[PDB]
Design a protein around this nucleic acid. Structure first.
Length: 80
DNA sequence: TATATATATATGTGTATATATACACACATACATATACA
């Protein structure tokens, strides 16, 4: 690590903090992405969202999904 | 001109809340302006 400080290279990893976060993180190319968790059931046409991505407010997400009429043509009722 | 309304203001010490602007940038939503056509 002293050699790496002298010559500006990396040895030890440095990952993002997933503490208190129940989705999952993936490194694609030059950036990380954060993923939330759904749960599907075709017997009732229900998807159950159980996790949002990092630092996403809940009511802002729900009001953002209601303004896209491209998505409103496929869903009927949304309950928190 | 008279007897009679019903709404209206201001004082101190209290109880509750509202709203405009700057600054950067990744991201989302709305056309619309053409360009092959058709």
């Amino acid at each position: 690590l002293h050699y790496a400080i002298k010559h500006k290279i990396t040895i030890l990893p440095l990952r993002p903090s997933n503490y208190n976060f129940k989705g999952h993180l993936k490194r694609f190319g030059q950036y990380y992405y954060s993923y939330g968790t759904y749960v599907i059931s075709e017997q009732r046409n229900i998807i159950t969202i159980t996790e949002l991505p990092l630092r996403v407010p809940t009511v802002a997400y729900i009001e953002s999904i209601k303004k896209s009429s491209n998505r409103m043509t496929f869903i009927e009722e949304i309950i928190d």
